[PDB]
Amino acid sequence: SVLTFQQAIQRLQDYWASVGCAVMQCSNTEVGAGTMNPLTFLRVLGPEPWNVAYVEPSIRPDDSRYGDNPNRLQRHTQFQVILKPDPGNSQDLFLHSLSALGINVREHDIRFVEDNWESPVLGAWGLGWEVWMDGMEITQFTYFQQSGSLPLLPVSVEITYGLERILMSLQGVDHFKNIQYTKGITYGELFLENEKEMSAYYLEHANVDNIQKHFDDFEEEARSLLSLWLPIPAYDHVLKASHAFNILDSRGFVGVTERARYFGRMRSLARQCAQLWVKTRENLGYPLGTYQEVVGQPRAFVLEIGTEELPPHDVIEATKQLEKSLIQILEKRRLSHGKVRSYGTPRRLAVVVENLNMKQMEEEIELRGPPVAKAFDQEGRPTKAAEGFCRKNNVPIDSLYRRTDGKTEYIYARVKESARFADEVLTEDLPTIISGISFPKSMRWNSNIVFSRPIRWIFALHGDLIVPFCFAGISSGNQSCGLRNSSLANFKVEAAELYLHTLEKAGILIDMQERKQRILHDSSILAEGVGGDIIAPDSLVQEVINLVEAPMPIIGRYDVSFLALPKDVLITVMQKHQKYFPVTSKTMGNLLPCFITVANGAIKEEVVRKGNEAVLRARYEDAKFFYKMDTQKKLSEFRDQLSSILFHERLGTMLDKMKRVENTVAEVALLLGINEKMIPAIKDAAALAMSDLATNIVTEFTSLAGIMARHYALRDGLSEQIAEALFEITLPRFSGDVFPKTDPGIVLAVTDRLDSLVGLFGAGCQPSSTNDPFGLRRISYGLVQILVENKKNFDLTKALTLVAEEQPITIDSGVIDEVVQFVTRRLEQLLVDEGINCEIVRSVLIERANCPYLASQTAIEMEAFSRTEDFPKIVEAYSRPTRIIRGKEIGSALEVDASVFEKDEERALWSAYLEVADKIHPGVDIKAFADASLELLQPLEDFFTNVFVMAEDEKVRNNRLALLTKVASLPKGIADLSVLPGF
RNA sequence: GCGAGCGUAGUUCAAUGGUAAAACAUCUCCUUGCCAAGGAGAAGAUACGGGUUCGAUUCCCGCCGCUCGCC
């Protein structure tokens, strides 16, 4: 029959005992996971080999739900296996485990989807995958690299089965209380009331001060026993203190600001138990050993680097910096070739260079060295440089001559190219090619070489002969693994020109652009067989392509009564978590009860559809309960939960922040010049803002912040524009998203971004680093795009003098004069990379930098004027009276008068100044300026020609100074003309 | 938190294994004087430290600053 719950264990722990793991027992203290058991956190540190495997429950109380939802339990059993050192087969033993416990691995769909692991409390992290059998995540698989705070050597492999998410799939059961434990008895009929009334304890009746005391008591005892040098009890007390913190957090007694203190209090206990254990081991001497460690026509050249499953976006950025790094070094070494072409797959990165040469080019080239001054001399030609110049080239020293190299120097000679057979060249240069590829996250598995996933085979051939070398303990050869668990899981390719034809004879489609066209072209037949078509945003196809090797699509049905949910929760479940394709009927274009999934390989396609249909019958069944729990109360009541989300420590939660916005959004609608008959209809849509952030859905689907506020608002019976404005307080959410277009949608999206700037700035967290906490870059970058894309006239130095007045911490006039600069630099960077010149955007941003729309308007309109032949007339016309007045003690400020203006050309210059200054007002555009100064430039050169400005008289020489101070100051407000070149 | 790319006169930019160039700015000499303009001349730099090589601005390592993605 089927596997019961105890046979699963009785077979897993004897299979893993045939391999060689010791089989221990669980602990006797409450833990939350398995990786914190005393014998997998302590005993991975050191040189000590530790193959072990055990079974333990895990108790985490904040997941207690009275035992009703069929997936979450407050006490669930695991199965943990740790292998140190990494044996090498570490994921071909796993798939023998699976078919050992009665699974048919040639029939289901086993997928290795990447998921890293990190935990700051223990101070550990590692890289690895999670295993999807028919859509269900069943197992985690990790290589460790830190533990405590000291790096690991050698690294450990951790495999952690979860034995109640496996047994519901292997048995056709939807609710855990129907799982057959042994022949006759059920799982519910053993653990139901423990599930039911330990929840009431961890959830309602836990005495919450006799735990607050026990936390500190355990902390003190573990800190004391770390001074008699006793690691064992000094860690058990850490275990039973981090337990008592969990049933504090569950009861809700931990506020919002104590968590950052509790985590710190308990992290430095595990951080310093580790350094004691690793030493008390080595004072014994490590009683468990120690870990120490030809000429012919051209032929093709193929190089493949097998791997274990890379992420979906480490194939794309590593199939480029390999082909480029090969293109360079093929010609750096004087070798000729043809059509070079790369490829990719989750577990191989191939490159093909066609008809590669057989020898180097072998031509003689000139080469000039040091000048005749340094090396050559009269009767002293060889000093110390000529010999060094001929030694590295071994040409005889009397084979040199001179050339007019600028100054008729630099003696030189010829050299040779030294043909080297094109297969002893690559031996020297390939390892530094393969070692060149660099990723953001990277591993170590058996040495100090770094890569993103372990390399398992290298297939590098040329013609018929093998290019021999070694990288990371693997000697290159001519074998390759095909589609896993098939008849061609290992083949050998003879000649490098029948590589591709052999590869696709084992099922693999390696050409990346011909997997997209066999996904999106066998999905359409399915979607049209039912009546509709797919929804494939090309940010999802680029991540479904690189999860598969030989694709195969399948349609599946889910229930119709789930169609009452919002459309944008159905599609987000089906896309961002399971990676499916929704289906919409192309007549009346809303959703249908179908989905399309992409299997991988030789699949039964009768069990995988039936297995996938029953996972999003469960995720939908949870989201529907959340939704029905969220329509129990009117939306205006979800505000008063907001006071339990942290924003920043010394300034507080989110409820106070949204409190500080209703009181200022009544003026930012006057700075932008918004119509009067909408300043009412904004403010009531300002109290409801950011309310959905405490909802039940949005805590689960944290990407629906903003959608599931408009959905509730419209349903409650508000206006349309209120609900629509309740959505664009979040736009834009990343780089390249739509901006707020409606009128009351700008006010709020601007008023929020003013606060999150002025508060975070005037309260310590300044971005002065390469480190970016709190995202102060994009928050400051979006505030200028909401304006330059929307034709709005703003004042950055008045709004920041008014949205800083509200904060709880005091804001002095000096700290808002750096926010303006941190915004202006961002505007300059936005403006330069639009194909603008760099010198004009620094001559408009000196006084037009306040209103970010007029600046971006008048900096594009100034370059086109700079390229016309009036720029050199104006930039000089205004430079003749600003240099001549570099300081001569002009004291009588205005002085522009006819008191004594007995000058000849003054009487015709001041008139021109008045008739132009009557046009140029402090906000004029650049063209009226550029046509109003061209007629002023002549009386200038008719004034300077005659009048001797400098003082031949004592008092009356200030007219002649003010009359030019004015003509010099006219462009104050339009452009700072003393920076542009050509002055 | 991690990666990626960068750093040359005062501002912008060429070059590369072995006399670091040019533009604008600055200075002096000219005089239908003080501004501008046309002419001659002069001075001025590889962020910093370390490594090989006879010689590194260039190849290698380490420190400081800047810009950009993810967290």
**Residue A338 tokens, joined:** 């043809």
Whole-angstrom distance, CA of residue A401 vs CA of residue A305: 50
A590 CB below 7 A from strand B atoms:
no
d(CA A298, CA A356): 5
**Which nucleotides of strand B lie within 7 A of protein CB?**
1-4, 11-13, 17-19, 24-25, 33-37, 53-55, 66-71
H/E run at residue A241: helix A231-250
Residues 6+ apart with CB under 8 A from A923: A854, A973
Domains A5-206 and A635-832 share a fold: no
Nucleotide nearest A388, from its CA to each C1': B54
Nucleotide nearest to A383 (CA to C1'): B54
CA separation (Å) from A165 to A136, A162, A171? Answer: 8, 6, 10
- Type of residue numbered A800: L
Place of tokens 């000096």: A814
Contact A459, A302 (CB under 8 A): yes
Looking from the CA of A221 toward its CB, the CA atoms found within 13 Å total: 15
Instruction: Check if residue A945 sits with its Cβ under 7 angstroms from strand B.
Output: yes
d(CA A598, CA A520): 11
A763 phi, psi to nearest 5 deg: -140, 45
Contact (Cβ atoms closer than 8 angstroms) between residue A970 and residue A916? yes
How deeply is A252 buried, as exposed, middle or buried, from its count of CB atoms within 10 A (0-12, 13-18, 19+)?
exposed
Locate all alpha helices (DSSP H) within A484-618, ordered by sequence. 500-503, 513-519, 523-530, 541-544, 567-576, 608-612
| Residue A372 contacts strand B, CB under 7 A | yes
Asked if A614 and A174 count as a contact pair (C-beta separation under 8 A), the reply is yes
A441 CB inside 7 Å of strand B: yes
Q: A233 to each of A29, A54, A230, A935, how far by Cα in Å?
A: 12, 21, 6, 92
Token representation of residue A888: 């001569």
CB-facing half-sphere around the CA of A757: CA atoms within 13 A = 29
Contact between residue A438 and residue A321 where contact means Cβ atoms under 8 Å apart: yes
A389 beta carbon to strand B: under 7 Å: yes
Which residue in the block uniquely carries the two structure tokens 């985690």?
A: A140
Distance CA A511, CA A532 (A): 29
Which DSSP category does A155 fall into?
A: P
Class of domain A5-206 as given by CATH:
alpha beta
Torsion, CA A318, CA A321, CA A326, CA A332, rounded to 10: -160
Q: How many angstroms is C1' of B15 away from CA of A131?
A: 55
Query: Measured from the CB, is A775 under 7 Å from any atom of strand B?
Result: yes
Sign (positive/negative) of CA torsion A202, A203, A206, A210?
A: positive
**Cα–Cα distance between A453 and A473 in angstroms, integer?**
15
User: For tokens 């394709």, what's the residue?
Assistant: A581
Q: From the CA of A817, how many Å to the C1' of B27?
A: 38
Q: Which long-range contacts (CB under 8 A, 24 or more apart) does A378-386 make?
A: A386/A411
Q: Which residues in A878-913 are b (16+ Cβ under 10 Å) and which e? A: bbbbbeeeeeeeeeeeebbeeeeeebebbeebbebb
Residues A758, A778: contact at Cβ < 8 Å? no
A778 touches strand B (CB under 7 A): yes
Nearest nucleotide (CA of A952 to C1'): B34
Coil vs helix vs strand at A954: coil
Looking at the DSSP bridge assignments, the partners of residue A353 are: A301, A340
Query: Å from A375 (CA) to B53 (C1')?
Result: 16
**Cα–Cα distance for residue pair A953/A957, rounded to 1 Å:** 6
What secondary structure letter does DSSP report for A604?
Answer: -
Q: What's the rounded Cα separation, in Å, for the pair A147 and A366?
A: 58
Chain centroid to Cα A673, Å, comes to 38
Q: Which two tokens stand for residue A592?
A: 């249908």
Nucleotide in closest CA–C1' contact with A945: B32
Q: Could you tell me the two tokens for A358? A: 């057989």
Amino acid at site A797: T
Segment A169-177 long-range contacts (CB within 8 Å, at least 24 positions apart) = A169/A133, A169/A134, A169/A136, A169/A138, A169/A611, A170/A2, A170/A3, A170/A102, A170/A103, A171/A2, A171/A3, A174/A70, A174/A614, A174/A618, A175/A70, A176/A70, A176/A71, A176/A73, A177/A67, A177/A70
> Which of A275, A245, A277 lies closest to A261 in space, CA to CA?
A245
β-pairing verdict for A52-54 and A22-23: parallel
**HSE, side-chain direction, 13 A CA sphere, residue A4:** 12
The contacts of residue A918 (CB under 8 Å, 6+ apart) are: none
How far apart are alpha carbons A571 and A577 in whole angstroms?
Answer: 10
Q: Which chain A residues in 304-363 sit with Cβ < 7 A of strand B? A: none
Residue A387, nucleotide of least CA–C1' distance: B54
CB atoms within 10 A of CB A339: 9
Task: Name the nucleotide nearest A979; use CA and C1'.
Answer: B11
Phi-psi group of A125: left, alpha or beta (phi > 0 → left; psi -120 to 50 → alpha; rest → beta): beta
Work out if A191's Cβ lies within 7 angstroms of strand B.
no
Token pair, residue A137, equals 């995540």
> Which residues face A597 on adjacent strands?
A554
Token pair 């509790």 is found at A262
* Among candidate residues A341, A374, A356, the one with its CA nearest the CA of residue A425: A356
Break chain A down into helix, strand, coil percent, rounded to 5.
35, 15, 50
CB A334 within 8 A of CB A361: yes
Find and give the residue nearest to B53, measured CA to C1': A388
Report which residue is nearest nucleotide B37 when distances run from CA to C1'.
Answer: A876
The answer to whether A839 and A979 have CB atoms below 8 angstroms apart is yes
Which residues, 6+ apart, have CB-to-CB distance to A302 below 8 Å?
A350, A351, A352, A353, A459, A460, A461, A462, A496, A499
Backbone angles phi, psi at A245, to 5 degrees: -70, -30
Please give the nucleotide, over all strands, whose C1' is closest to the CA of residue A946.
Answer: B32
Give residues with Cβ within 8 angstroms of A89, minimum separation 6: none
Two structure tokens written together for A737: 């998203």
Residues 6+ apart with CB under 8 A from A472: A446, A447, A449, A451, A455
Beta bridge partners of A151: A146
Separation CA A594–CA A600 (nearest Å): 20
Bridge partners for A706 per DSSP:
none
Q: How far is residue A41's CA from residue A122's CA, in Å, rounded to a whole number?
A: 9
CA–chain centroid gap for A976, Å, is 40
Measured CA to CA in angstroms, residue A576 lies from A375, A569, A580, A790 at distances of 69, 10, 8, 32
Conformation bin of residue A652: beta by default, left when phi > 0, alpha when psi is -120 to 50: left
Omega before residue A85 within 30° of 0, cis: yes
CA-to-CA distance for A179 and A933, rounded, in angstroms? 89
Residue/partner pairs of A372-381 with CB below 8 Å, 24 or more apart:
A372/A402, A372/A408, A372/A409, A372/A410, A372/A411, A373/A409, A375/A411, A376/A411
Q: Which two tokens stand for residue A114?
A: 């990447």
Q: Is the CB of A385 under 7 A from strand B?
A: yes
A451 touches strand B (CB under 7 A): no
Distance measured from the CA of protein residue A337 to the C1' of nucleotide B18, in angstroms: 34
A983: Cβ under 7 Å from strand B?
yes
A539 touches strand B (CB under 7 A): no
A840 token code pair: 């004009």
Peptide bond into A468 cis (omega under 30): no
**Cα distance between residue A222 and residue A234, in whole Å:** 4
A275/A343 Cα distance (integer angstroms): 46
Query: Which among A134, A283, A976 has a CA at the least distance from the CA of A618?
Result: A134
Per the CB < 8 A criterion, the answer to whether A599 and A554 are in contact is yes
A365: phi then psi, degrees, rounded to nearest 5: -125, 150
Residue A885's nearest nucleotide, by CA–C1', is B35
Is A395 (CB) below 7 Å from strand B?
Answer: no
Resolution in Å equals: 3.6
CB A559 within 8 A of CB A617: yes
Three-state DSSP state, A876: helix
Give residues with Cβ within 8 angstroms of A770, minimum separation 6.
none
Report the amino acid identity of residue A802: L
Query: Token pair for residue A583?
Result: 């289906």
Nucleotide nearest the Cα atom of A735 (by C1'): B69
Helices (H) and strands (E) in chain A, counts: 34, 30
Other beta carbons less than 10 A from residue A576's beta carbon: 11
Nearest residue to A852 via CA among A923, A779, A778, A791: A791
- How many angstroms separate the CA of A458 from the C1' of B33? 83
Contact A270, A72 (CB under 8 A): no
Q: Rg (Cα) of chain A, in Å, rounded?
A: 37
Indicate left, alpha or beta for A833 from its phi (over 0: left) and psi (-120 to 50: alpha). Answer: alpha
**Contact between residue A477 and residue A470 where contact means Cβ atoms under 8 Å apart:** no
Q: Which two tokens stand for residue A304?
A: 């493949």
**Cβ–Cβ < 8 Å for A150, A156:** no
Nearest Cα residue to A931 out of A913, A916, A910:
A916
Start-to-end C-alpha separation, chain A: 93
- CA-to-C1' distance for A883 and B20, Å? 34
Could you give the CA distance from residue A913 to residue A623 in angstroms, rounded to a whole number?
73
Q: Are A27 and A41 in contact (CB under 8 A)?
A: no
Q: Which residues pair with A76 in a beta bridge?
A: A58
Quick one: DSSP state of residue A348? B
* Burial label, A697 (beta-carbon count in 10 A; 0-12, 13-18, 19+): buried
DSSP structure class, residue A489: S
Tell me the domain boundaries of chain A. Answer: 5-206, 299-361+421-503, 366-414, 514-630, 635-832, 862-969
Maximum Cα–Cα distance across chain A: 121
- A560 C-beta less than 7 Å away from strand B: no
Per CATH, which fold does A635-832 belong to? Answer: Hypothetical protein af1432 (1.10.3210)
Q: Is the CB of A440 under 7 A from strand B?
A: yes
**C-alpha distances in Å from residue A409, one per residue of A369, A374, A394, A953:** 9, 10, 21, 63
A772 touches strand B (CB under 7 A): yes
Scanning every strand, the nucleotide with its C1' closest to A941's CA turns out to be: B36
Nearest residue to A603 via CA among A557, A646, A565, A553: A553
Separation CA A449–CA A472 (nearest Å): 7
A905: which residues sit within 8 A by CB, 6+ positions away? A939, A942, A943, A945, A946, A947
Contact, A364 vs A412, CB < 8 A?
Answer: no
- The 3-state DSSP class for residue A281 equals helix
How many C-beta atoms lie closer than 10 Å to residue A63's C-beta? 17
Please report, rounded to whole angstroms, the spatial distance between the CA atom of protein residue A767 and the C1' atom of nucleotide B3. Answer: 19
- DSSP letter assigned to residue A644: G
Nearest residue to A906 via CA among A955, A963, A970, A969: A963
Contact between residue A132 and residue A110 where contact means Cβ atoms under 8 Å apart: yes
Residue A983 CA to residue A980 CA, distance in Å, equals 7
Burial A597-607 (b: 16+ CB within 10 A, else e): bbbbbebeeee
Burial class (CB in 10 A: 0-12, 13-18, 19+), A520: middle
- Residues A479, A491 contacting (CB under 8 angstroms): yes
> What's the CA–C1' distance between A770 and B3, in Å?
12
**Interface residues 706-735 of A with strand B (CB < 7 Å):** 734-735
As a whole number of angstroms, the distance between CA A454 and CA A472 comes to 10
Q: Rounded to the nearest 5°, which phi and psi values hold at A168?
A: -75, -30
- The continuous run of DSSP H or E covering A926 comes out as helix A926-932
Rounded to the nearest angstrom, the gap between the alpha carbon of residue A869 and the centroid of all alpha carbons in its chain is 48
Strand B interface, A 871-900, C-beta < 7 A: 876, 879-881, 883-884
Do residues A82 and A158 touch, judged by C-beta distance below 8 A? yes
The CA–C1' separation of A400 and B54, in angstroms, is 18
Scanning every strand, the nucleotide with its C1' closest to A368's CA turns out to be B18
